Each structure stands twice: as structure tokens, then as C-alpha cells.
Amino acid sequence: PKESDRCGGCGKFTLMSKKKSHHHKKNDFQWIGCDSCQTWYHFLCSGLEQFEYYLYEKFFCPKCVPHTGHSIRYKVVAPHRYRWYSPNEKHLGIEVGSKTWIEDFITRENTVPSPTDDEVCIVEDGYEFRREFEKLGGADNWGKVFMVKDMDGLNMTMPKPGFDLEDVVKIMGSDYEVDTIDVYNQSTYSMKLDTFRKLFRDTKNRPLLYNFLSLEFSDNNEMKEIAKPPRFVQEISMVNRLWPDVYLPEDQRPKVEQFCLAGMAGSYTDFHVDFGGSSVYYHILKGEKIFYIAAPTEQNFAAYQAHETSPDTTTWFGDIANGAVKRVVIKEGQTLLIPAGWIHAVLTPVDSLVFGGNFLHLGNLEMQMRVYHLENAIRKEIRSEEKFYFPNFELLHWMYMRNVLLEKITEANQEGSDMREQEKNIWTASQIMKAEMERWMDRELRLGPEKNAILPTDDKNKIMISVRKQIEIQTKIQNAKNK
């Protein structure tokens, strides 16, 4: 509540990877007044970091702290509410992920049913993983979750244990800004990596718990060699296929295959499906995670879909999910491999450091589209576009169809090969991807291009047309082995 008077800081008067803090940078230029010297500051100019904007009831500017001591935070009047500072909320009900709800969930969580052998497969090491994965038909048929106790045989480059946050801030830099989840407030704010470091190392005082979204390091030349996807992931990753480690501008590469995650004990991430129906690898370098997961059945998607567009905020999805939710504990040194569509929440019982990544692959093409449809539906239903969705989803597919599939189909045609003999998978994938893209093309006809579409409609039709033709031709080549 300030007048036409000036900010003591500035002296003036009145997306390729996962990022969420950039949305409410509209608080940056709201005002905070120092409680001592009574000078006013733009939040941005106050010395406060984004995550602290809302914390202090009494703010002391950097010029008064020496004699006032530190700013005073609001009293936690409602531990069971996201708005824990608000007295007018003390009487409302326990919200999921609030401090209250978490500590009450920690006592009961382990009464969540273990999963069936059709849902999750636990193996001792990467060599066994490969055998079991293969016995179930490999990547083209990858449908269950795998937990791999020991990473040997997995061919996944990870740092040696003991590598820790300090190493990360060393590499990325002490000033690097990471999007961090204020867990109790179930919102995302930017925080210096060094500040997170500090908060993390202070094991005694933790008014709020912080857990970082996705520090994606694929463009840090040192980091990107330290922690990588299992080789088998690299071999099936659609993005890696189109943008091989260095055609197609790097500024259009979806950047989600190499993330670092750090989380405090008692951290909770609520149920979701990974953007784009993408699959994930996840190695616990330090700590422990408990995943609560549910199969991607049509019914669980319906259930989950209604849980997300429900205004309700106090019901745990697991509790109204007809028992579909299963518990899996992933311990330090262990690795989790999750294929498309799995619904999951995560509890972090213990201070943790994790390396992981998201990817799209042709073997889950159908499920990826399904999830995509789910996201589109949920978006229409609730304007909560703090959400992050798979960067350049459709563009990825246009490039993949053009650069990869179309080329294969055409080659096969030019030599008169029946693709079913040696390339059946590529053939069935092309048809499914094509059908989905026709839908996109039609939608674009009835309602125009999206706000962000990189590919010009022109280039899209000229691709669609080359494809229809090569597919017709191959369809004839196949029908021709008939009598």
C-alpha cells in the first residue's frame, strides 16, 4: 500500500525445459516497505529472492538488518493449508501436501499395497533388467515399471557416490537459478542454487521444505558428461534420434532428458502423469523415494482426470482410486524405469539427490498420444496453466514423421519391399502416428494454428501429402503378395 514515492533500490517512483517460476514474475514489481526505515522497495529490488516475497510479515531492508536483525516471518497459523500464514483459513480442512497432511501421511503411507508382478518388476542389476525387459518383448512392448537394484549392466553413466550438492553448485555455478517447489505452499519459486544449498545443509531449521523441480543440465558441458540416460534409453529416445549429440535448430530441441533433482526429507509431490506421456529413468544417487503408482488403464485415467479438475484439495487420489494405487520404495543406488502413462505421486522420506530424465519413444506411441489427449482435456477444464507440458510435442512428431518414418517407407517403396518382413514396427508406428497427425491437421483447418506452432501449415500439408502417398504405395506393395 504505497504512494507516488520512490523505490530505495532502483530509485524509481510508482520454454524448452521444465520451468514454472516465470509465471508470477508479476510480483517482482509489487512493493514491500521496510518496517524500520520505512523506505519502499520493488520486491525485485528489495534483495529478497522470489521464494521469500511472501514469507515476511515484518520486512527489514538490507540497510536495517545490521541493527534490526532479520525480517520476521508470518506465524504458521494454519499448518494444514497451503496459505499457512492465513488466520481466515485456520478452520478449513487439511489440504494434501500441507505440513499437517504430510506428517499424517507418513504414519499411514506404508499401509499402501505393494504392486503386482504384472505392474512392477524388481531385478538385482542391469544385466537381469535387460533379460527381463527382453522376455517381455523389449522396448516396443514396454509396459511395466522396473526397479533395478544395482546399475551394473545398465550402461548408465552416473557420478560416483559422494558426489553431492556442493559438486552441483560448483559445476552449475553458485548463482544459477533453479525452480524450486515450496512444498508446504505447493507452489514454485526461483531460488539461487547456492541458497538452496544453504537451506539444504541446515538440517536443524526447516520451517518450509524445498525440493527442486528440474535442473536440466544437458547444455552444461561438464554436467552433461557426468550423468546420462541408460544406453537403451538413448537408443529409443525420439528426441535423441532427431537431435543427435552435437539439422533441426538446437533452440527447438525439447530439453528434458537430463535433470537433477534434490529434495528435503518430508517432501511430497502429488499425483501426475509425466508430460507428453513420456517415460522416465530415475537413479537415486543419495537418499530414498517412495513412489505411489497406478497403471494407465482407461478407467484410472478417467478417475485421475476427475481428481484433477475437481476443485477439491483435501482428498488423496489414492483414497478414491478403487485400490489401483501401489507403493514402491526406491533406495539409494537404485534405479527406476517408468514407461508411458503411469500415474504417480512421490514421497521423499529422506534428504535426497537424484538424476533422471524424460523421453518419448515409438514403442509407447499410442500411450503417449492418449496422455496427450488427457492433458488437452484437463487444460480445457481448468485454467491452471502453471502446468508444464512436453515442449514442442507436435513439432517433434512432424520432424520424426518427415526425417525418420517417411524416409524409411519411401526407401522400402523404391526397392519394392514389403515392410512387414523386416520393418513391421516402423510400419505400424507410422500409421498410428499418421492417423493422430491427420486429427491435428483437421483441427488446424477448423480453428487455425496454435499460438505457438513453429512449423508453417504449408510445410505440414506438404509432409502430410508425401506421407499419404508413400503409405498408399506401400499398402499396394503389400496387397500385391495376394492371389
Ligand X SMILES: O=C(O)CC[C@@H](O)C(=O)O
Binding residues: 269-274, 282, 289, 344
Residue whose CB is nearest to Fe ion in the complex, by number: 274
Picked from Zn ion, Fe ion, ligand X, none, the partner binding residue 45 (CB below 5 to 8 A depending on kind) is Zn ion
CA 9 to chain centre: 36
- Give yes or no for a contact between 161 and 286, defined as CB atoms under 8 angstroms apart: yes
* Binding of residue 32 to Zn ion (CB under 5 A): no
From the list 254, 291, 252, the residue with the least C-alpha distance to 271 is 291
Picked from ligand X, Fe ion, Zn ion, none, the partner binding residue 328 (CB below 5 to 8 A depending on kind) is none
From the list 179, 175, 206, the residue with the least C-alpha distance to 192 is 175
Picked from Zn ion, ligand X, Fe ion, none, the partner binding residue 34 (CB below 5 to 8 A depending on kind) is Zn ion
Q: Which of 32, 48, 55, 61 binds Zn ion (CB under 5 A)?
A: 61
Q: How far is the CB of 238 from ligand X (least distance, A)?
A: 18
Residues with Cβ within 8 Å of residue 429, at least 6 apart in sequence = 362, 365, 405
Letters for 222-261 (x = contact with Fe ion by CB under 5 A, - = none) are ----------------------------------------
Residues with Cβ within 8 Å of residue 319, at least 6 apart in sequence = none
117-176 binders of Zn ion (CB under 5 A): none
* Binding of residue 10 to Zn ion (CB under 5 A): yes
Q: Distances in Å between the alpha carbon of 301 and those of 289, 298, 352?
A: 24, 5, 30
Q: Which residues bind ligand X (CB under 6 A)?
A: 211, 261, 263, 269, 274, 289, 344, 346, 348
- Parallel/antiparallel/unpaired status of strands 120-125 and 145-150: parallel
Residue 108 grid cell: 499411514
Q: How far is the CB of 291 from ligand X (least distance, A)?
A: 8
State phi, psi for 235 to the nearest 5 degrees: -75, -25
Q: Which of 32, 45, 96, 396 binds Zn ion (CB under 5 A)?
A: 45
* Binding of residue 65 to Zn ion (CB under 5 A): no
Residues with Cβ within 8 Å of residue 90, at least 6 apart in sequence = 77, 78, 81
Residue 266 grid cell: 518430508
Picked from Zn ion, Fe ion, ligand X, none, the partner binding residue 123 (CB below 5 to 8 A depending on kind) is none
Residue 80 grid cell: 494444514
Q: How far is the CB of 353 from ligand X (least distance, A)?
A: 11
Q: How far is the CB of 39 from Zn ion (least distance, A)?
A: 5
Picked from ligand X, Zn ion, Fe ion, none, the partner binding residue 320 (CB below 5 to 8 A depending on kind) is none
d(CA 341, CA 106): 26
**Which residues of the shown chain bind Fe ion in the complex (CB under 5 A)?**
274
Where does this chain bind Zn ion (CB under 5 A)?
7, 9-10, 34, 36-37, 42, 45, 61, 63-64
